[PDB]
Design an enzyme around this catalytic site. Sequence first.
Site, short mmCIF file in Angstrom:
data_model
loop_
_atom_site.label_atom_id
_atom_site.label_comp_id
_atom_site.label_asym_id
_atom_site.label_seq_id
_atom_site.Cartn_x
_atom_site.Cartn_y
_atom_site.Cartn_z
N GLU A 69 41.31 40.94 40.52
CA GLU A 69 41.95 41.96 41.38
C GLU A 69 43.43 41.73 41.46
OE1 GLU A 69 39.85 41.67 45.12
OE2 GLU A 69 38.57 43.33 44.65
N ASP A 277 37.63 43.33 52.51
CA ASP A 277 37.58 44.40 51.50
C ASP A 277 37.97 45.73 52.14
OD1 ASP A 277 36.03 42.39 50.03
OD2 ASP A 277 35.06 43.99 48.91
#
Length: 393
Positions: A69, A277
Amino acid sequence: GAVATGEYRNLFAEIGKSEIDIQRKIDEAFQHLFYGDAKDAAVYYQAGGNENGPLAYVYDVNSNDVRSEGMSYGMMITVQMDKKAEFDAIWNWAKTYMYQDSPTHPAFGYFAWSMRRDGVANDDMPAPDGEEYFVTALYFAAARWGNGEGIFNYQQEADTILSRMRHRQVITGPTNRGVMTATNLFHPEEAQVRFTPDINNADHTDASYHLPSFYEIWARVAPQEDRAFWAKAADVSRDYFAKAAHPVTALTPDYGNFDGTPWAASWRPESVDFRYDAWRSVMNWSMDYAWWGKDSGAPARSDKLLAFFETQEGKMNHLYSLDGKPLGGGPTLGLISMNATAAMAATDPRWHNFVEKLWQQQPPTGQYRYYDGVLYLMALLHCAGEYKAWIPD
Ligand code: NA
């Protein structure tokens, strides 16, 4: 939408900041995170070079692991900032060390989510939002800089990687976590990104991985045979946010089912709450609204989230039940940053306060600076009107 007009909102200028100060804010964030003190400030490491030229990576300084990520956010930041050298360096390390190119390996076509700094994977399975940012950043690189060859044929790399994300077959074989079986990265019928392609937990999703703003790019520039699928994915995600966000607070859970309900992972049952998240969900839908203007629910949802966080002034946590009960922590730069991006869609003028709160921050230092820092810099670029859709030919 901003893509049609070419006019991206500079939310910092709308709350009264000068362009020189805005540019200094971005420049300082970039300089700290990419070129700051190695022990306390930077998250970017220059890692020699290979046949493609320089190698570098963005890494989680806490665990001391490279995350897919962070690499993909690094690429997105650098293309937005016109930093080709850094983009190419990051991409080179991702494609060299993280991307699985063996067609008999269950991770074929995917980037390992967690890799040690020597290139040894901790886990060959992907964090699918990484792939999503990689592809989009690559298309943007093609648009801004034109295509090179080999790994720097940005558009060809994006096309191939994205096609495989859709069309990947089921593969079983050895990995660094033992034998695994994995599938494609988007459900073929639901047209939703998976939380994981690992077959044991494949039929789930994660609201913060829904990126309709990017699916709209892919619907325009992907391999022609897949464009209608990415257009469907964009529409599906707008409905997904409507279902997945709490109707009072607009908080989303970390992980979810395709029907929009929260999903408790067996190894992390607290995934049904608003945690690390889910901080990003608001950015995703707000960006989509600002760019495309199609998600008619995004302004209200952004307004709800900001109204909720206004109730938390002076007692802000960073972990919440979806109906708004604090579950721990204090304020974090990452969550402040993501909340500010809600202003890309919010209508109620309390958004001014959230953009000002972001303005008042400084680049992060210390052990948690990776996730806070990549979110901060992305948020600064969005709020400055500097995070744009660079659509290739
Ligand atoms: Na395959």
